[PDB]
């Protein structure tokens, strides 16, 4: 019943936890809780919908106004006007949302892929002692665009070389 | 990275399914206006005749 | 004016919460179904930590949270009178939940 | 009954009066040895005192504090706290280093972040050199003490054996001691470490100093405080023995009210 | 080591040939256990 | 629910009360106000008693408020103190602990 979507929500809510950001995610779900928990408290508080004409006719002395009331109740047994009124709305924005949400879901799986293989690649060859530094040339000319840079610039400093390789001297 | 990038996975279709339960649920409240229209008239009438 | 060690203070911290579990206000009874959740929490010091100004909205708003989610939990208790394994544990998880939030 | 809830009551006084009356003699006798101390130590502080007179020394800032480790103590904890509070008024991010629980949880109170350092166990004993050593050695470690070139250390001064009155003085520091205008009148070498060494030794004999006047203090505030307790308590008795007088004539009446009664049918 | 708590060692070794008062002892052993104190928060007592 | 000694206000809205939200409608309101005979007021917890044992009787089970009981108290010490019995502690009757236990 309620139960279906709220255990849907809140499972929902430990998840959305996960993602950042949801400074008015939680206004619209306050606002669904909300008037949700209107309608059963609605639900619950109801009257019988007409008069008990029963008891409370045979009470009465004063004839014909238990029908008049009951006529009444029975005329406006057509409440008012109720209609699915985000039916265009409701479509329009899930299509919008919808269309986002493949958006990021094709991109994700995609990345996850991609991770998988260079996850795979450092695994199926680690270079950690030899592959020659022509190569290492070779895979990236910003190695040459950072020697010729150097010497073009007449430092032979290499800062962030002695931050994590040391230095022999012998001041 | 990999990790990052499983939270959004698993997010990112199952959240559809609250997006559109969520909106759908708010349709059901509409149709409990109704409800509480026809829960007032009733009470009212009652209560007028007790009063007779 | 004795001053209170750590321990005895944990003791008296848990049980001030307690006393403001207790308190309802007149013409206000309640259902004990919805009465066994709040001394599960209280006494499984769940409320220990929580301020002590807040535990009245804590009190209010747990049990909103219970018929929000745990509704089938509370006709379990009005169904059985016993807590069950399965009880004790959907309500410690629910409990939980509703510590922070 | 009334008359024995009365009674109770003026029991329970009674009791009060004892203790606050025995509390107030051993005061006395602990108050002795206190001050006793406090000339000792004094004289000992007024050594290194007289080279720092001589260098004309002068002085983030590092605030210090000591009280006692308990209560019935008298105002000395609550005393010295609005008086740290004022002087946290004359620094908006020292760094309280707190020698005694009194003190200890009050300022914590005003300031969650200047607590930095805090002792426990010091004031159930009278002031030794050992634990004003460790906390001094335990300063310079944990808190690095030379690098603030300001100290300030706060203790309650006995002002009359009557009074106690919430002090402070300036712990100096060893950048200073270089560079104090006389530094050169008394002579050491080259190759002294004098500033690193002079810096520390005074760290605890001058924080030794500043225990043995808040310990003598503590020990003469509780006796004024015990005595006053006495009197107070006093007041309490003879107004509960009023009360216990009356309601044990009252009692006689009422039941001989129902004796009359019963001899009137 | 500390300059102070070099010469604080010292004594309390140099009160050990004993003739020696309790009052010198007590001077010489310790009975504290420093809180340290975070920024609120505090690390454990050790005992100084 | 019994009222013993209490006066019709008090009673009136206690009724409204009981009324109010909606609870009235398997009570049975058995009252002796202020105003009320002492006798009436002696006699006003044991004839409630039996209209409890009505219930007890039938099988049925149901609770009986005797509020306040020590207004019984003091209508037994009326009743007793003009019918001139020797009047016990307090000036209550002695067997006002034997009418409080039957």
């Given at each position: ?78 409440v ?28 994700v ?37 950072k ?25 | ?11 990112a ?40 | ?38 001394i ?62 | ?91 908006p ?43 001094a ?44 205008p ?20 005074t ?5 030794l100093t ?46 001989l ?9 | ?48 | 629910?019994?009222?013993v ?5 008090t ?92």
């Open positions: 019943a309620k139960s279906a979507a709220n255990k849907l929500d809140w499972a929902k809510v430990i998840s959305s936890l996960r993602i950042t950001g949801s400074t008015a995610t939680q206004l619209s779900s306050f606002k669904k809780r909300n008037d949700e928990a209107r309608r059963q408290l609605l639900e619950l508080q109801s009257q019988p919908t007409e008069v008990d004409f029963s008891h409370y006719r045979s009470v009465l002395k004063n004839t014909s106004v238990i029908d008049k009331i009951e006529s009444y109740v029975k005329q406006y047994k057509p008012k006007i109720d209609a699915s009124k985000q039916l265009q709305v409701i479509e329009s924005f899930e299509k919008h949302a919808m269309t986002n949400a493949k958006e990021t879901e094709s991109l799986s995609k990345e996850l892929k991609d991770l998988q293989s260079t996850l795979d690649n450092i695994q199926s060859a680690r270079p950690f002692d030899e592959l020659t530094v022509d190569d290492l040339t070779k895979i990236k000319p910003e190695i040459d665009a020697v010729e840079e150097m010497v073009k610039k007449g430092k032979w400093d290499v800062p962030g070389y002695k931050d994590r390789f040391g230095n022999l001297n012998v001041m | 990275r990999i990790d990052s990038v499983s939270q959004l996975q698993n997010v279709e199952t959240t559809k399914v609250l997006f559109d339960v969520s909106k759908e649920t708010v349709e059901l409240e509409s149709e409990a206006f109704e409800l509480k229209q026809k829960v007032e008239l009733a009470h009212e009438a009652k209560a007028v005749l007790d009063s007779w | 004016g004795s001053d209170l060690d750590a321990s005895t203070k944990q003791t008296l911290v848990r049980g001030e919460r307690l006393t403001q579990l207790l308190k309802q206000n007149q013409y206000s009874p309640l259902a004990t179904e919805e009465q066994v959740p709040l599960y929490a209280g006494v499984n010091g769940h409320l220990d930590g929580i301020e002590l100004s807040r535990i009245g909205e804590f009190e209010s708003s747990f049990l909103s949270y219970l018929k929000s989610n745990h509704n089938e939990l509370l006709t379990e208790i009005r169904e059985k009178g016993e807590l069950s394994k399965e009880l004790l544990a959907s309500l410690k998880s629910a409990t939980e939940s509703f510590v922070a939030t | 009954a009334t008359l024995k809830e009365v009674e109770m009551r003026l029991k329970s006084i009674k009791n009060i009066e004892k203790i606050t009356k025995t509390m107030k003699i051993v005061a006395s006798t602990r108050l002795s040895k206190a001050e006793k101390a406090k000339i000792s130590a004094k004289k000992m502080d007024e050594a290194e005192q007289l080279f720092y007179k001589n260098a004309e020394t002068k002085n983030k800032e590092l605030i210090v504090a000591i009280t006692s480790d308990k209560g019935l103590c008298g105002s000395i904890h609550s005393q010295l706290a609005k008086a740290v509070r004022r002087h946290l008024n004359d620094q991010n020292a760094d309280i280093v707190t020698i005694g629980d009194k003190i200890k949880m009050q300022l914590l109170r005003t300031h969650p972040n200047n607590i930095k350092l805090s002792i426990n166990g010091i004031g159930k004993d009278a002031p030794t050199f050992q634990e004003s050593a460790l906390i050695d335990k300063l310079l470690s944990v808190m690095k003490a030379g690098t603030y070139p300001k100290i300030s250390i706060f203790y309650n001064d006995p002002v009359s054996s009557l009074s106690f009155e919430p002090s402070e003085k300036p712990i100096f520091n060893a950048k200073t001691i270089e560079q104090s006389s530094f050169g009148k008394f002579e050491i070498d080259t190759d002294a470490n004098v500033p690193r060494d002079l810096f520390e030794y760290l605890a004999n001058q924080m500043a225990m043995a006047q808040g310990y003598a203090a503590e020990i003469s505030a509780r006796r004024n405080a015990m005595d006053n307790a006495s009197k107070n308590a006093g007041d309490m008795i003879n107004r509960y023995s009023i009360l216990y007088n009356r309601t044990r004539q009252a009692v006689i009446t009422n039941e009210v129902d004796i009359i009664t019963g001899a009137s049918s | 080591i500390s300059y102070a708590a070099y010469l604080n060692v010292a004594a309390q070794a140099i009160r050990s040939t004993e003739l020696q008062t309790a009052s010198v002892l007590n001077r010489s052993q310790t009975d504290a256990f420093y809180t340290q104190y975070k920024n609120a928060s505090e690390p454990t007592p050790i005992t100084k | 629910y019994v009222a000694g209490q006066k019709r206000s009673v009136a809205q206690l009724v409204q009360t009981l009324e109010q939200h909606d609870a009235m409608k398997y009570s049975i309101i058995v009252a002796a106000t202020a105003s009320e005979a002492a006798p009436l007021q002696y006699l006003a917890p044991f004839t409630a008693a039996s209209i409890g044992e009505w219930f007890r009787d039938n099988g049925k089970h149901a609770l009986i408020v005797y509020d306040d009981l020590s207004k019984q108290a003091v209508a037994y010490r009326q009743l007793s103190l003009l019918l001139r019995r020797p009047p016990g502690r307090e000036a209550y009757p002695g067997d006002v602990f034997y009418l409080h236990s039957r």
